[PDB]
């Protein structure tokens, strides 16, 4: 427990998790919506997916 | 004037009727409705199973020219 020749930093980093809140004005963004559209594939010998 | 030659005119048109549809794929949807004959027919996986009787194989279609089980005749 001698002291080195050199001194030394000691850096790290953290993480803290937080519970945030959003405002949003109104208005402030335009949207478009599509029709949805429903398709089948994987045809298994068993069962289909959608 | 009119010759008429060939057959096709009035003719090949039901053949190729018959001759043209392909299966189903990309069905939209409706969210109030949620159900139809629409999506029901896209769903129909159209089993081949026998009830044993005349009309009822026939409606099954397991009488069927191609190798899977179509029914509708």
């Keep these: 427990k001698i002291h080195p020749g050199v001194a ?34 994987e045809a298994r010998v068993d069962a289909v997916t959608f | 004037m009119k010759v008429q030659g060939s057959v096709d005119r009035r003719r090949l048109q039901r053949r190729i009727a018959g001759l043209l549809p392909p299966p189903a794929r990309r069905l939209n949807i409706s969210r109030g409705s949620e159900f139809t004959r629409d999506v029901r027919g ?5 089993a081949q199973a026998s009830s044993l009787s005349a009309a009822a194989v026939w409606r099954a279609g397991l009488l069927a020219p191609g190798e899977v089980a179509v029914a509708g005749g």
């Design chain 1, 8 to 41: 030394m930093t000691v850096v790290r980093t953290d993480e803290i998790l937080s519970e945030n809140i959003l405002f949003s004005s109104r208005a402030s963004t335009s949207m478009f919506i599509g029709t949805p559209n429903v398709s089948r594939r």
């Design chain 2, 42 to 46: 896209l769903v129909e996986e159209h």
